[PDB]
Ligand binder design. Structure first.
Ligand SMILES: *[C@H]1CC(=O)N([C@@H]2CC(C)(C)N(O)C2(C)C)C1=O
Ligand SMILES: *[C@H]1CC(=O)N([C@@H]2CC(C)(C)N(O)C2(C)C)C1=O
Ligand SMILES: *[C@H]1CC(=O)N([C@@H]2CC(C)(C)N(O)C2(C)C)C1=O
Ligand SMILES: *[C@H]1CC(=O)N([C@H]2CC(C)(C)N(O)C2(C)C)C1=O
Ligand SMILES: *[C@H]1CC(=O)N([C@H]2CC(C)(C)N(O)C2(C)C)C1=O
Ligand SMILES: *[C@H]1CC(=O)N([C@H]2CC(C)(C)N(O)C2(C)C)C1=O
Ligand SMILES: *[C@H]1CC(=O)N([C@H]2CC(C)(C)N(O)C2(C)C)C1=O
Ligand SMILES: *[C@H]1CC(=O)N([C@H]2CC(C)(C)N(O)C2(C)C)C1=O
Ligand SMILES: *[C@H]1CC(=O)N([C@H]2CC(C)(C)N(O)C2(C)C)C1=O
Length: 87
């Protein structure tokens, strides 16, 4: 019968859940990664981004699985004002 009962609980959490939350049009519309969300300045390197090809296999995995900016949220090279979330 379907997969075995999933761990839909995890008590490890505590206050990092609940509270005033109201999604919007559900998560972004993927199924077509191209240029429907990523937009700003012409394609280049560093200033803009990098222009990879198939992330999750060669784009990233080290500065995220071992040290993700979410932990030491303070260093960050550029774009430090994005800390307010006013994005
Ligand atoms: C799955 C297990 C779990 O509980 N996780 C963490 C820790 C708590 C606080 C329990 N969560 O709800 C989050 C997702 C933050 C898991 O990732
Ligand atoms: C409300 C919906 C939600 O889940 N939110 C965030 C992100 C996750 C990890 C799903 N949470 O349980 C918290 C509350 C941290 C919301 O903003
Ligand atoms: C984006 C909220 C940016 O300021 N919020 C989100 C998440 C990241 C990846 C940081 N972004 O640039 C978008 C807009 C997708 C702002 O800081
Ligand atoms: C299709 C939509 C998208 O952007 N995406 C991401 C989601 C995660 C799991 C973060 N990832 O590494 C991929 C590239 C799969 C999709 O699967
Ligand atoms: C370098 C190649 C590229 O287009 N890019 C974008 C992709 C997303 C995840 C939208 N983004 O915010 C960056 C700047 C990473 C690269 O990383
Ligand atoms: C945002 C839109 C997108 O798919 N993208 C690419 C750019 C690079 C860094 C090559 N990459 O692996 C992602 C998926 C982030 C953006 O810059
Ligand atoms: C660069 C390519 C990518 O999508 N990615 C992950 C890493 C974490 C921080 C887990 N994450 O939510 C994104 C989508 C940025 C990279 O390391
Ligand atoms: C940055 C590095 C990474 O992969 N990551 C995870 C952490 C949670 C909140 C579980 N998540 O869905 C992302 C992809 C953001 C980071 O904090
Ligand atoms: C530290 C905590 C966090 O997740 N974060 C954002 C800031 C930007 C650069 C917008 N981003 O994509 C991450 C996830 C690093 C912080 O400033």
């Amino acid at each position: 019968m379907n997969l075995e009962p999933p761990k839909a609980e995890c008590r490890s959490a505590t206050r990092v859940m609940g509270g005033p939350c109201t999604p919007r049009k559900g998560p972004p519309k993927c199924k077509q990664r191209q240029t429907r969300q990523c937009k700003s300045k012409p394609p280049k390197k560093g200033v803009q981004g990098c222009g990879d090809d198939i992330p999750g296999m060669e784009g990233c995995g080290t500065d995220i699985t071992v040290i993700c900016p979410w932990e030491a949220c303070n260093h960050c090279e550029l774009h430090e004002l994005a800390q307010y979330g006013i994005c």
